[PDB]
C-alpha cells in the first residue's frame, strides 16, 4: 500500500528531529413470388454450429447487432471485450486455491 503515509517509528532515520522526537515520545390482392432465390444462399448458415441445439436458439440468438451504430457505448465495450485479458509481464502458474 503506497497510499496514506504511515507514521515514522524506528526505521526511517531522516533527521535529528526524527531521532530526537521519536526518542522523547519513546521516552514518555397480392401475388408473392413464392420461389427461393439462388444468390441469397451463400449468406445462410449451412448447419447449426456446434454448441447449439435448435434453430430458434441459434437464429434467435444472433438477434442484436454488435456495433457502435446500433448499441450504446457501454454495451459495445461490454459486448466486444474479450474473455481472457492478457497483460504484459510474467504469468506464473497459480499458487493457491482461488475459492
Amino acid at each position: 500500500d503506497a497510499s496514506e503515509l504511515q507514521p515514522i517509528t524506528q526505521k526511517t532515520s531522516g533527521t535529528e528531529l526524527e531521532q530526537t522526537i521519536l526518542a522523547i515520545m519513546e521516552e514518555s390482392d397480392v401475388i408473392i413470388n413464392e420461389k427461393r432465390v439462388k444468390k441469397n444462399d451463400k449468406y445462410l448458415a449451412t448447419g447449426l454450429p456446434h454448441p447449439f441445439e435448435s434453430q430458434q436458439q441459434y437464429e434467435r440468438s444472433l438477434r442484436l447487432p454488435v456495433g457502435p451504430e446500433w448499441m450504446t457505448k457501454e454495451t459495445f465495450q461490454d459486448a466486444t471485450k474479450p474473455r481472457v485479458i492478457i497483460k504484459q509481464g510474467i504469468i506464473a502458474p497459480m499458487s493457491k486455491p482461488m475459492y
Partner: protein
C-alpha cells in the same frame, strides 16, 4: 515487472508509476518503436507519482556533483521514503528503474525492499526511461513553470565551472 522508475532531470527528481509495461520480448519491433516514439501512446504507459524540484541552484550543483560520481543525497532518500512503500525484501518487493548501476546498488542498500533495474543492464527500462527523456517536457509541463533548457544550461555552466575551478583563476576580462 517494473513498478516505478526514477527520472532525474536538471530541474529535479520525478518518479513515475509505470502501468501497462513494455513488450519485454518485442522491444525492437517497429510498432513498439512507434508506441515508444509518440506521446499519445507512451503516456498510457507512464503516470507521474511525484515531482521534487530544486529549492536552490546550490542544491542543483551538489546534486550533479553527487550524482555524477553516483552517490544519492539525503533528500533523494527523503523523496523515496515519501513515495516508495515500507518494504523489506521478506515477502513483497518493489521494482524501481534507475539509469545508474551504483545508484541502484546504493538505493537497494538504503531501502532493503526496493530492487532496482538499471538502464545500463536492461534494455526494457533503458527504453521505458528513454522516452521519458524524449517526452519529459510535455510530461512535466503541467507542474514545472518555464523551460527546462535554461535550467539545464545554467546547471551545465555551474557544473563545468565547479568541476574545473574556472573563474577563480580566469581574470582576463
Amino acid at each position: 515487472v517494473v513498478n516505478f522508475l526514477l527520472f532525474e532531470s536538471a530541474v529535479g527528481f520525478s518518479l513515475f508509476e509505470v502501468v501497462h509495461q513494455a513488450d519485454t520480448v518485442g522491444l525492437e519491433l517497429p510498432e513498439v518503436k512507434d508506441a515508444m516514439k509518440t506521446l499519445d501512446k507512451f503516456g498510457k504507459m507512464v503516470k507521474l507519482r511525484s515531482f521534487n524540484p530544486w529549492t536552490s541552484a546550490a542544491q542543483g550543483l551538489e546534486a550533479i556533483n553527487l550524482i555524477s560520481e553516483g552517490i544519492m543525497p539525503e533528500y533523494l532518500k527523503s523523496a523515496l521514503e515519501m513515495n516508495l512503500p515500507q518494504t523489506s525484501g521478506k515477502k513483497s518487493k518493489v521494482v524501481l528503474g534507475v539509469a545508474d548501476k551504483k545508484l541502484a546498488g546504493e538505493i537497494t542498500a538504503a531501502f532493503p525492499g526496493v530492487q532496482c533495474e538499471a538502464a545500463d543492464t536492461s534494455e526494457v527500462v533503458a527504453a521505458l526511461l528513454r522516452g521519458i527523456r524524449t517526452h519529459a517536457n510535455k510530461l512535466h509541463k503541467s507542474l514545472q513553470e518555464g523551460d527546462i533548457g535554461r535550467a539545464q544550461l545554467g546547471l551545465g555552466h555551474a557544473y563545468s565551472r565547479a568541476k574545473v575551478k574556472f573563474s577563480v583563476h580566469k581574470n582576463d576580462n
